[PDB]
Design a protein around this ligand. Structure first.
Ligand code: 145
Ligand code: 145
Ligand code: NA
Ligand code: NA
Lengths: 988, 988
């Protein structure tokens, strides 16, 4: 019985536990004076849906092509119409039976013709910096080998195969392979040759690999330099010239430069250098820095650093995994502009070019090997490749290539074995190899909590509580006494925290307080830097981002791929604005009397000499006083009290009580930096003289009784409902109590703990908060003042099939100019349902106005949204925006746009403007209803209906981060309760 | 402070705990020779959306009508374009704050002008037989009163207010009222005057109320007759003439008729009678029957009866609660035609006309008062009206009116206090009143399990297990010793069981076995008789039923209103067909050797003399032998063995082994009955000589190898997939394993018990059964016979992100005429997921054929569908239907149409037909895919895609009744396992 199935050969290679075949050794990516020819451009592409019908028709030659077509290389090929993106979070998109590949497996045949001059002879190589996920390579029909590790680099000796003149390079790329089982990151499955292809000549007497070792002696200030160079794996003679430090030395020997300026992310000093031999010179930037762990702290150059970090994925909304270099230096300067000083390359090494930019601009980076086996957790880690001895070779090759490529860059301060890969023998072999190859950086891996084979203790989304226990080193002890002693001596890092999906993330301040208070806490990396939105052009031609499912997936994880501080096009979300203020590197506590302010330098190395300290006093109309104050530089981790000019304090003292004014002390960039122009704001602080409470109007005007309506000054009531129908000509279509909001992404998440496993959003639906109803109980006039009268409208708010309720008593008084509105809420019945207390989103009013709103202005926090557990970035001021820029363009629309702590507010409606005053309320103004916003799954599903939805909230919930990790914290949860609050309105 | 809200007066009447105002006493509905004028016809109608804007503009007069329009009366008015039906199951459609009514409360103003002749003077009354839910009545602008209890009757004295000639009658009808809180049945909320309006003259010396008392002495055969008559509540002189029994007697005296033929549902003997006084005669039908409880059995006329019952709601797909009398006698004759002998009027008294038809046609009925407070359960029965002393008067009035109207009808054998109303003081007062007023019928109420105030123990959906424990009186004892002693002495009835939603109900046979085995078990009433589908005409003009939500509800319960044995138009579902055979009143066990058959008479009173006993022998082509056999009548609960003609046995013996033939003994109606023509089938039984197994083809034909395809006789394989591409010209687009089916309604239900709270349908989605995938492992030819060869195609079936799998090995042999196909399935891995074992719907194959199928024929069970725990109604035979009549037109489409126990099968595809043979398999043939059927929410969402979906199942799950009650029973659950099965195909 002989076998008759097609394609058995390709499939057995794809299902291989072995690493690629026939490539050269792993080495650093080096800047070399050898000639190079980038084969990037416009290739030819043919796509077959499986190895069983992938033609073996000699396409690899370049002759008689049938069924090819122009495609760009580098590309993620489902971004150019061939198939589609497919998004899965933890679930594998194929049956889990390693190492087998599904029958449906896109095969992409790639072909380019190039010219090879005499520079590339007698010796050259081809270099592929990234092939997702398994490539086979032919040069002139001759097999060069295979690539494994989709974001790793492979090099192939083409000596004797590369011909002079015209060559034909052919690569066959399979989307799925056994390697898929170990590349299960939470991102888009996008196959292709997404990184540079390059021909490089290899002259004789060259340099293949260089290993820079540039340490720093913080007690003496010495550099410690030893540049190793090698050819064909042997130490070679080469000369090391670093001009600026006045040294020439031999490669291979360690020397003590007498005094160097150390490298950090605050001061990223880079000495230019070259190592050269007869046939080849190599350029290097060199940062003198030394990483160590002592007294359970993570120290750089002798000082405990604080990691203000994010998790950078490589994604672009129209090119997939290809990220244009202009987009890279833009997003990285964006990061510095928001006080970020660390980056973690979740969850694979980045583009080779990325490393030098982290060296230059200034970031502590965690360089992470391409390894993740998350999809195996659901089966209790059965068959997990991290513990299958059949994968040792494959995984150690991923670590070697990872380490080798980037070992020379001072910005990488940690190697990371990978992510969400379980525990296992192979992980320990990856650690063992790395400690041997590069003892100079400590080793990170979160997935083995025992921390046996790492040097730092690392967790994701550990609660603010557990983080305080670890900060004091009193977390519960490991079962192994020996292991526990080790882990207790490591510093602690959160590689992922404050999950920034949608509206949020809440609770950042609580985490930051612990980072400053506890030295064993290293800091943390927000999840994540960007959303992976993929732009989708509609029939109309409107643009919007699509997410998981939108592209036809059979299994997918929805909008969980859009969970970042910036959108796919790097437009900041309010979370970035908040985070920037949270991690701000100086704190400015402005004194109540406006005489000075305390300045703490929170940096680890720099002093304050880089910063101009400006102040301004803003009153209602314009600025009253402003300028600059000179601060004698304060050391890192030192504090001074700096006086402000006496004019500022005298101005505060002479304010008529109840007149608002805000003192803002800014710290801005004295001079341009590599990442921002002079005057860029780094840190700030404020003191506010508040307005007094608003004067309730005298109830001098009485209540006029028509048969169908009532009238009390400028407000028109309906005798059937009790609610206002107009105020000063402004049509009022509805007025009621609100307790609910269109759920955020965190509200859609399950908050672990509590026997209530339903998401808050579900809790609400079950409770009926989204479908409240109001019964009218009574309407009265009552003795006012000098003939005038108050109006009291009694209602009860509740929901169908529910016994709990709230009584709401609206009480109006008017003098003819301003309407007064007192609102009282009292609970009737226990607000219990399906066994669990109900929690409210808010305690407010919804005014539905009959006309459109063009412009919203307020006094309070701003300019961007704020909620109880967010809003740190929103300062006290006077703001004014067009309605459409009050919204927040989240990909799945949801509750956003509340401006908390608001004191006054004006909506410009056609010709008239509507002025609310009162004690602190949260303002929100949208052109569509809450239910339109809740049902909407993408932004085009939001349509204005010509009215205005005015939200005035006397209380709000926090937002938390329950979509992944901690929910709203106790101090910010909103339990049902009685409440009382006063407003005053006015139309002009 | 004086109150300024509109409509405070109507609302305080609507919110009233009191019963109607100013009507005459509750009395029986009587056939009287007094003149009557039905005000039914075409009324005028104005609809206001709340009492606060219901005009008080003197519409009640009939002059200057503004905003009225022609409407039929009786009507449910949302069936005629005014508003819409709204379906809620247990949830109230308004905030639960009794007695308050929501602001949104349709007010329907009704007006008719009629002519009153001299017959109606000086004394007459108006009679409303039903007003949902609160009516106010004016005759010539003069208030007559108010109605409460939507399916109860009210009568108003119009003496001195009804004028001669032309009158104007005005009724204002509010949909919601305090009474809504006690009318929360699981049905459509439809307001209006849905039952007859009638003017009736009341001559002097008349009869107002009559109370028939017609018992039976089963030891002597005597009738015991006493007809009470009364006027203005006092016993009056009247004469009682029952011609047929040769008696004239005075009303008020009890007499002993020497010998009467008793009344039962099997023999509903009705003696015509009249009671008359000077001004009025009243006609009566009189059934002599006596109900008693002894030895914990429910006995009628001395014999323990068995209740073969259903729950009749009053519903019509286009008229709502109005059920045309032709539809009533049709549905009731339908019921008799399916062996039903009992009816329960869930959950309100029916149309007055219904009672006489139950007397005549023959049904034990449970007459149920309009009371149900289900929506209060979710709050722990807080504020439940059954225990609020403020409702005593309202509820006792509902019981009185209920009892009074129908007390004279022998078919009612139980009064029922209501349904799903909790326990409470008012319920006990309802019971106390009823025992006093009418001691002759026992009292039913399920909602108080202690059974303190009832005479029978009644439950819903108690499992087959608990029912056997009760059958033996060994259920766990009540906490109160005294109560427990009472309940243990009552007989037991299931007022609702075997929930017949969608495909089902499964498990009827298990219940029936217990009914026969245990005398304390009275029987049961299927839930429910009909679906409440409401027809919806689409733009195309296609008709289909809509259900909850489809009409715009804010809260609703989906398709739970369509849960019956017949659809809204009384077209039978397969459940009725099964149920008819289950409850069949004789059992015919046909002997294996075909010499005779055992006959048990299961009736309680009749013998077999009504039945012709026919037999037929059916072979492949036509009938071989047939006729009639004479059975000496067997008593109720007796058995005989009746010989069949010797020709029948000799025919069986002379059959060549492996030739199929079926002996069917039928018991049909010898002569016409009030409910069916002669020859109607009542009970049947069969013995089958099976076919032998099919001969596997000799593998004489070899496997031809092209580069792209294989060929083995008439079958064409694809070398890439391994699956057949054609068999005898018939395009085969896909062939694979099936383990899943589009979930039924029961599969969508939560099966209580087991820590798995997810519905089976959810279990499956979580497990991936709906999205299986097949990887190909190998293909071989192998040594066959005389040059020929088998083909073995090895696959593995599984699902993305899952480790469990099944290996499937397809093995084909051919001789050139017939294809042989052996299929083997073996488990690889534990089929566990989210902590709970996965269960399969089936173990079968899905053939997707490229051409349409016109006609399906098979040998096996039929003609209607069958599944392991259903299909009793399907007999052994030869059947043949067009494809579209293989389907089942469920309102939410779902898994149906499997014909289990099938031996052979032919699909006619254009010109050729495809013949499957093999051991018992379950056949199914649909014109659309399973996923089309699962996604479809209504029948118009099913569209044929031009192909054929052939389902051959070697194993199946039962269907159960998990949508309400027990799921699939143990013996019918399908756990994963290895399996082996052989098929043979053939194309002509
Ligand atoms: O770490 N976890 O316990 C965990 C629980 C639920 C979902 C994701 C998850 O892991 C984390 O999720 C984030 C953000 O979505 C990223 O995908 C990250 O790579 C992953 O480690
Ligand atoms: O009786 N029950 O415990 C129960 C549990 C869940 C849903 C309905 C239910 O009660 C029963 O349901 C049926 C069929 O849907 C009818 O509505 C019936 O009137 C009701 O008593
Ligand atoms: Na994510
Ligand atoms: Na139902």
């Amino acid at each position: 019985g002989r076998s008759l199935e097609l394609g058995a050969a390709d499939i057995q290679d794809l299902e291989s536990f072995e690493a690629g075949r026939g490539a050269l050794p792993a080495r650093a990516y080096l800047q070399s004076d050898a000639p190079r020819l980038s084969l990037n451009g416009e290739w030819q592409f043919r796509l077959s849906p499986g190895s069983r019908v992938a033609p073996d028709d000699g396409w690899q030659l370049g002759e008689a092509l049938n069924g090819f077509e122009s495609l760009p290389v580098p590309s993620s090929w489902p971004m150019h119409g061939h198939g589609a993106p497919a998004y899965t979070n933890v679930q594998f998109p194929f049956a889990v039976e390693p190492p087998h590949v599904p029958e449906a497996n896109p095969i992409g045949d790639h072909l380019v013709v190039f010219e090879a001059g005499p520079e590339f002879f007698p010796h050259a190589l081809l270099r592929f910096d990234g092939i997702e996920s398994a490539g086979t390579v032919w040069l002139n029909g001759v097999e060069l080998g295979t690539t494994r590790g989709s974001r790793l680099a492979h090099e192939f000796d083409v000596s004797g195969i590369l011909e002079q003149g015209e060559n034909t390079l052919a690569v066959r790329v399979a989307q799925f392979s056994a390697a898929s089982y170990v590349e299960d990151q939470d991102m888009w499955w996008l196959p292709g040759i997404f990184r540079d292809v390059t021909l490089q000549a290899r002259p004789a007497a060259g340099i293949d690999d260089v290993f820079v070792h540039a340490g720093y002696d913080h007690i003496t200030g010495e550099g410690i330099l030893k540049v190793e160079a090698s050819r064909g794996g042997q130490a070679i003679d080469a000369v090391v010239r670093v001009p600026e430090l006045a040294l020439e030395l031999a490669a291979g020997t360690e020397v003590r430069v007498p005094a160097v300026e150390p490298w950090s992310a605050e001061v990223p000093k880079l000495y230019e250098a070259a190592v050269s031999a007869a046939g080849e010179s190599v350029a290097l930037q060199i940062g003198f820095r030394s990483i160590a762990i002592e007294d359970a702290q993570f120290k750089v150059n002798g000082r405990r650093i604080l990691l203000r970090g994010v998790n950078r994925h490589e994604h672009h909304p129209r090119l997939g995994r290809v990220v244009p270099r202009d987009v890279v230096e833009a997003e990285l300067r964006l990061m510095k502009q928001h006080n970020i000083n660390a980056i973690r390359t979740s969850h694979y090494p980045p583009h080779p070019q990325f490393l030098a930019l982290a060296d230059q601009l200034g970031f502590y980076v965690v360089l992470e090997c391409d390894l993740e086996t998350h999809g195996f957790e659901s089966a209790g880690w059965a068959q997990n490749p991290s513990d299958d001895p059949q994968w040792e070779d494959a995984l150690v090759d991923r670590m070697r290539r990872t380490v080798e490529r980037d070992k020379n860059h001072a910005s990488v301060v940690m190697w990371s074995l990978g992510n969400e890969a379980g525990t296992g023998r192979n992980l320990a072999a990856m650690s063992r190899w790395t400690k041997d190859r590069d003892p100079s950086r400590p080793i990170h891996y979160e997935g083995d909590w025992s921390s046996e084979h790492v040097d730092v203790y690392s967790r994701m989304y550990a609660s603010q509580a557990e983080t305080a226990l670890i900060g004091q080193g009193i977390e519960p002890a490991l079962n192994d006494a020996a292991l526990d002693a080790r882990r207790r001596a490591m510093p602690f890092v959160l590689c992922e925290y404050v999950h920034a999906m949608g509206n949020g993330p809440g609770g950042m301040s609580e985490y930051q307080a612990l980072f400053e208070k506890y030295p064993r806490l290293m800091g943390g990396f927000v999840w994540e830097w960007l959303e992976h939105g993929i732009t989708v052009s509609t029939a109309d031609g409107v643009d919007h981002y699509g997410y998981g499912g939108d592209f036809g997936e059979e299994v997918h994880d929805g909008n969980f791929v859009t969970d970042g501080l910036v959108d796919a096009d790097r437009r900041p979300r309010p979370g970035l604005l908040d985070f920037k203020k949270v991690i701000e590197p100086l704190r400015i506590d402005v004194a109540r009397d406006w005489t000075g302010f305390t300045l703490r330098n929170g940096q680890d190395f720099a002093d304050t000499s880089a910063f101009s300290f400006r102040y301004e006093v803003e009153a209602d109309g314009g600025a009253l006083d402003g300028g600059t104050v000179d601060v004698a530089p304060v050391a890192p981790q030192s504090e001074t009290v700096v006086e402000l000019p006496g004019s500022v304090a005298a101005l505060a003292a002479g304010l008529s009580d109840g007149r608002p004014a805000v003192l803002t002390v800014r710290a801005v960039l004295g001079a341009d930096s590599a990442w921002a122009d002079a005057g860029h704001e780094v840190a700030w602080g404020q003191s506010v003289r508040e307005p007094g409470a608003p004067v309730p109007p005298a109830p001098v005007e009485p209540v006029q009784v028509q048969d169908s309506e009532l009238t009390l000054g400028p407000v028109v009531f309906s005798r059937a409902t009790g609610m206002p129908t107009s105020i000063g000509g402004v049509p009022v279509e509805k007025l009621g109590l609100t307790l609910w909001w269109a759920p955020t992404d965190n509200d859609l998440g399950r908050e672990w703990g509590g026997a209530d496993e339903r998401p808050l959003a579900t809790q609400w639906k079950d409770a009926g908060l989204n479908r409240l109803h109001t019964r009218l109980l009574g309407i009265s006039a009552n003795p006012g003042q000098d003939g005038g009268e108050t109006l009291t409208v009694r209602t009860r708010v509740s929901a169908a099939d529910k016994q709990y309720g709230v009584l709401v008593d609206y009480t109006w008084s008017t003098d003819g100019e301003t309407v007064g509105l007192r609102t009282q809420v009292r609970r009737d019945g226990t607000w219990v349902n399906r066994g669990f207390e109900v929690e409210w989103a808010r305690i407010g009013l919804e005014f539905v106005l009959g006309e459109e709103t063009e412009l919203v202005s307020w006094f309070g926090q701003g300019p961007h949204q704020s909620y109880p557990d967010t809003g740190q970035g929103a300062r006290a001021g006077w703001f004014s925006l067009p309605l459409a820029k009050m919204d927040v363009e989240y990909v799945r629309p949801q509750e956003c746009g509340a401006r908390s702590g608001s004191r006054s507010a004006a909506l410009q409606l056609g010709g008239r403007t509507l002025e609310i005053c009162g004690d602190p309320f949260a303002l929100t103004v949208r052109p569509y209803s809450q239910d339109v916003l809740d049902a909407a799954a993408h932004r085009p599903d939001l349509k204005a209906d010509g009215r205005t939805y005015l939200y005035v909230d006397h209380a709000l919930r926090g937002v938390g981060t329950a979509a992944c990790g901690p929910g709203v914290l106790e101090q910010y949860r909103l339990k049902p309760r009685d409440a009382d609050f006063i407003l005053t309105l006015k139309v002009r």
